[PDB]
Scaffold this active site. Structure first.
Site, PDB file in Angstrom:
ATOM      1  N   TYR A  89      19.024  13.255 -13.339  1.00 32.27           N
ATOM      2  CA  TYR A  89      17.617  13.097 -13.677  1.00 32.27           C
ATOM      3  C   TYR A  89      17.346  11.635 -14.037  1.00 32.27           C
ATOM      4  O   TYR A  89      18.168  10.982 -14.684  1.00 32.27           O
ATOM      5  CB  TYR A  89      17.261  14.046 -14.840  1.00 32.27           C
ATOM      6  CG  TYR A  89      15.805  14.035 -15.266  1.00 32.27           C
ATOM      7  CD1 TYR A  89      14.779  14.272 -14.348  1.00 32.27           C
ATOM      8  CD2 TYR A  89      15.456  13.784 -16.591  1.00 32.27           C
ATOM      9  CE1 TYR A  89      13.434  14.256 -14.743  1.00 32.27           C
ATOM     10  CE2 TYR A  89      14.122  13.767 -16.999  1.00 32.27           C
ATOM     11  CZ  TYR A  89      13.116  14.001 -16.070  1.00 32.27           C
ATOM     12  OH  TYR A  89      11.803  13.953 -16.478  1.00 32.27           O
ATOM     13  N   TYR A 130      14.333  13.745 -23.869  1.00 32.65           N
ATOM     14  CA  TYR A 130      15.623  14.012 -23.232  1.00 32.65           C
ATOM     15  C   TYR A 130      16.719  13.396 -24.106  1.00 32.65           C
ATOM     16  O   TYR A 130      17.270  12.348 -23.765  1.00 32.65           O
ATOM     17  CB  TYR A 130      15.643  13.360 -21.847  1.00 32.65           C
ATOM     18  CG  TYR A 130      16.520  14.035 -20.816  1.00 32.65           C
ATOM     19  CD1 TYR A 130      16.151  15.253 -20.244  1.00 32.65           C
ATOM     20  CD2 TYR A 130      17.705  13.436 -20.389  1.00 32.65           C
ATOM     21  CE1 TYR A 130      16.938  15.853 -19.267  1.00 32.65           C
ATOM     22  CE2 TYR A 130      18.497  14.025 -19.419  1.00 32.65           C
ATOM     23  CZ  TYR A 130      18.112  15.230 -18.859  1.00 32.65           C
ATOM     24  OH  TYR A 130      18.906  15.801 -17.892  1.00 32.65           O
TER      25      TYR A 130
HETATM   26  N1  LIG Z   1      15.438  21.510 -14.766  1.00 34.84           N
HETATM   27  C1  LIG Z   1      15.251  20.213 -14.562  1.00 34.84           C
HETATM   28  O1  LIG Z   1      13.999  19.839 -14.866  1.00 34.84           O
HETATM   29  C2  LIG Z   1      16.289  19.284 -14.052  1.00 34.84           C
HETATM   30  C3  LIG Z   1      17.652  19.528 -13.895  1.00 34.84           C
HETATM   31  N2  LIG Z   1      18.651  18.652 -13.381  1.00 34.84           N
HETATM   32  C4  LIG Z   1      20.047  19.121 -13.372  1.00 34.84           C
HETATM   33  O2  LIG Z   1      20.191  20.305 -12.571  1.00 34.84           O
HETATM   34  C5  LIG Z   1      21.450  20.918 -13.039  1.00 34.84           C
HETATM   35  C6  LIG Z   1      21.277  22.440 -13.206  1.00 34.84           C
HETATM   36  O3  LIG Z   1      20.326  22.666 -14.252  1.00 34.84           O
HETATM   37  P1  LIG Z   1      19.108  23.707 -14.176  1.00 34.84           P
HETATM   38  O4  LIG Z   1      18.827  24.332 -12.838  1.00 34.84           O
HETATM   39  O5  LIG Z   1      18.058  22.858 -14.807  1.00 34.84           O
HETATM   40  O6  LIG Z   1      19.467  24.688 -15.237  1.00 34.84           O
HETATM   41  P2  LIG Z   1      20.262  25.984 -15.256  1.00 34.84           P
HETATM   42  O7  LIG Z   1      20.072  26.257 -16.739  1.00 34.84           O
HETATM   43  O8  LIG Z   1      19.958  27.089 -14.288  1.00 34.84           O
HETATM   44  O9  LIG Z   1      21.817  25.563 -14.928  1.00 34.84           O
HETATM   45  C7  LIG Z   1      22.804  24.956 -15.798  1.00 34.84           C
HETATM   46  C8  LIG Z   1      24.015  25.835 -15.877  1.00 34.84           C
HETATM   47  O10 LIG Z   1      25.173  25.231 -16.542  1.00 34.84           O
HETATM   48  C9  LIG Z   1      25.974  26.291 -17.095  1.00 34.84           C
HETATM   49  N3  LIG Z   1      26.804  25.716 -18.194  1.00 34.84           N
HETATM   50  C10 LIG Z   1      26.738  25.143 -19.451  1.00 34.84           C
HETATM   51  N4  LIG Z   1      27.895  24.792 -19.995  1.00 34.84           N
HETATM   52  C11 LIG Z   1      28.825  25.156 -19.026  1.00 34.84           C
HETATM   53  C12 LIG Z   1      30.223  25.071 -18.982  1.00 34.84           C
HETATM   54  N5  LIG Z   1      30.960  24.587 -19.965  1.00 34.84           N
HETATM   55  N6  LIG Z   1      30.853  25.524 -17.877  1.00 34.84           N
HETATM   56  C13 LIG Z   1      30.125  25.983 -16.838  1.00 34.84           C
HETATM   57  N7  LIG Z   1      28.805  26.195 -16.777  1.00 34.84           N
HETATM   58  C14 LIG Z   1      28.179  25.724 -17.911  1.00 34.84           C
HETATM   59  C15 LIG Z   1      24.935  27.345 -17.571  1.00 34.84           C
HETATM   60  O11 LIG Z   1      25.364  28.683 -17.530  1.00 34.84           O
HETATM   61  C16 LIG Z   1      23.735  27.144 -16.630  1.00 34.84           C
HETATM   62  O12 LIG Z   1      23.611  28.165 -15.608  1.00 34.84           O
HETATM   63  C17 LIG Z   1      21.822  20.267 -14.376  1.00 34.84           C
HETATM   64  O13 LIG Z   1      22.916  19.448 -14.131  1.00 34.84           O
HETATM   65  C18 LIG Z   1      20.581  19.513 -14.721  1.00 34.84           C
HETATM   66  O14 LIG Z   1      20.856  18.396 -15.519  1.00 34.84           O
HETATM   67  C19 LIG Z   1      18.299  17.434 -12.836  1.00 34.84           C
HETATM   68  C20 LIG Z   1      16.890  17.095 -12.874  1.00 34.84           C
HETATM   69  C21 LIG Z   1      15.992  18.037 -13.499  1.00 34.84           C
END
Ligand SMILES: NC(=O)C1=CN([C@@H]2O[C@H](COP(=O)(O)OP(=O)(O)OC[C@H]3O[C@@H](n4cnc5c(N)ncnc54)[C@H](O)[C@@H]3O)[C@@H](O)[C@H]2O)C=CC1
Ligand SMILES: NC(=O)C1=CN([C@@H]2O[C@H](COP(=O)(O)OP(=O)(O)OC[C@H]3O[C@@H](n4cnc5c(N)ncnc54)[C@H](O)[C@@H]3O)[C@@H](O)[C@H]2O)C=CC1
Lengths: 289, 289
Positions: free
Chosen positions: A171, A181
């Site tokens: 991001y 953030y």
């Molecule tokens: N939602 C947003 O506005 C934005 C998200 N991102 C990135 O996208 C990626 C996915 O995030 P999202 O779709 O937002 O959320 P999401 O909440 O669906 O996915 C993040 C996942 O990481 C897992 N997690 C946490 N600690 C963990 C660990 N120790 N081992 C394995 N899994 C673990 C969780 O179960 C969760 O499903 C992240 O890296 C986030 O930083 C990048 C830009 C924007």
């Protein structure tokens, strides 16, 4: 036969799902890496058909999930598992959830893969601003959100075919300051992007494997909703929809189709890059309003 | 029915050709915009089947060229062309080759299109370094290589459907110095890249049209060879193949497949960006050996 492992899925409202959905359109086998604490609940929802509609692909097909394995990015090998977790109710009835273990598990059951997706983030103090983030919380954010990518590459490269591809999500907060953030998340993303470049060099030179990172726009997912600072995510989305060059809703499949392209051989010449998929918001300096 | 106008093709050794080839795999109709000085030669070779082999698309497909028109990016409208070029040996037997005329021409014969490719550059004093480039030569490089993009957009935007895509080609010399890329070409690329962002805002807000630019690696093309510096191009190619994260020959079709992706709807959320397709060379700072 293309096989893709997606690390970081706990439901259908995140980017991991949008990516799996788009990869299915191209017939790639999907394997989910589920964080232990939500594994059982995820299986329950899956089994009770709560995701059925979310699995139907445009081309009138069903998403083909090869497997779903418990996976924790904070543990490199078996002897890294500490007491407190080794006794945790949610971890008790589970085994082989460390990075090296899942890599061995996948290799043993399905052979080598050629697509890897790092789609996970986590920071204990994401609610606090950088100045008030503790050393422990800061290192926690980096360990889970940044180092996890390096470790994933180190262990999975052994079960990957030449010319395979890897991607992660980042991001813009890493490059420009966005109040809200916190917890070292902006720091972790900065490392992730830098590490992606260095990894591209090593992986490219020694194994002919590519690695890129996608800088996505706001998405109201679980991880995002838990950043609150009507919460941080609601503000970013509204702002993006008002001032971005392209005034349209950003879908998880928008990042999915781009991810799909970067994971395929169509992009054999792209590596170590940070690709922005945010309707162009990042190019703006001064808004109209 | 996808229709793409490629502005900047004088043979089969450039990026314009690799882009055309890749677009044909997706069955998009191709319209070539040929610079008048080389129009007759190009038509001659094409007619005598000197490109029949280059038109072979892997899957035995035969490159689908819709039309081939004379085109000069230095002229916006009919009354912009001067008396001299007007009566020039190479221009006499031709007409409707200004930016406004080709747009009206394409519209009148095929209706609206949805893909525009700016694949041209030109600089009279490219052989001189920035310090020794004259005002005339500098403005000539910007006029032909940068303004041409803005103008193309101004006239073609009226014959393009909503959600259509536009791409141009650039080189890293705009961001970092490469001795030998003179005549103001580095300047032109810097302008083009900045203009791409500004146009993304305008094109995006008013027409819901996207525009991005591809920063390609070295390709031994005609324009590249003009940069007599064993010539600049041989050095750049040799340097890219020995130090890039991915050590492999960069093909025009590698840029082509990326161009294809950016011109399709799969990239609906990307705009105003500079995408590097250079085997990762741009991420390196200090070479190895
Ligand atoms: N939602 C947003 O506005 C934005 C998200 N991102 C990135 O996208 C990626 C996915 O995030 P999202 O779709 O937002 O959320 P999401 O909440 O669906 O996915 C993040 C996942 O990481 C897992 N997690 C946490 N600690 C963990 C660990 N120790 N081992 C394995 N899994 C673990 C969780 O179960 C969760 O499903 C992240 O890296 C986030 O930083 C990048 C830009 C924007
Ligand atoms: N070859 C390389 O190493 C690199 C090229 N680029 C860019 O790729 C683009 C295409 O270049 P190449 O494939 O290298 O060369 P190319 O020489 O095949 O294509 C450029 C074309 O522009 C046309 N041209 C010149 N003045 C014109 C005018 N006034 N009106 C219309 N057409 C005109 C020429 O006939 C020529 O076919 C250029 O913008 C170049 O700067 C970017 C990175 C690297």
């Amino acid at each position: 036969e293309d096989i893709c492992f997606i690390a970081g899925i706990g439901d259908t409202n995140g980017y991991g799902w949008g990516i799996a959905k788009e990869l299915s359109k191209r017939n790639v086998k999907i394997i989910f890496g589920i964080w232990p604490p939500v594994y059982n609940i995820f299986m329950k929802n899956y089994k009770n058909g709560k995701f059925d509609n979310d699995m139907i692909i445009d081309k009138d097909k069903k998403m083909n999930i090869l497997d779903m394995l418990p996976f924790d990015a904070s543990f490199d090998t078996a002897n890294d598992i500490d007491e407190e977790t080794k006794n945790n109710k949610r971890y008790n009835m589970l085994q082989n959830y460390t990075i090296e273990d899942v890599a061995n598990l996948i290799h043993q059951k399905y052979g080598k893969i050629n697509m890897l997706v790092h789609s996970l983030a986590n920071a204990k103090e994401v609610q606090k601003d950088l100045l008030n983030t503790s050393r422990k919380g800061y290192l926690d954010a980096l360990s889970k959100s940044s180092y996890s990518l390096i470790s994933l590459c180190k262990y999975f490269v052994n079960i990957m075919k030449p010319q395979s591809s890897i991607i992660s999500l980042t991001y813009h907060a890493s490059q420009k300051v966005v109040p809200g953030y916190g917890g070292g998340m902006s720091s972790a993303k900065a490392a992730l992007e830098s590490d992606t470049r260095v990894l591209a060099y090593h992986l490219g030179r020694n194994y002919n494997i590519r690695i890129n990172t996608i800088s996505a726009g706001p998405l109201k997912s679980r991880a995002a909703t838990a950043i609150n600072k009507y919460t941080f995510i609601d503000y970013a989305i509204e702002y993006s929809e008002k001032y971005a060059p392209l005034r349209q809703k950003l879908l998880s499949t928008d990042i999915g189709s781009v991810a799909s392209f970067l994971l395929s051989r169509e992009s054999r010449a792209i590596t170590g890059q940070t690709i922005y998929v945010d309707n162009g918001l990042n190019i703006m300096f001064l808004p109209d309003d």
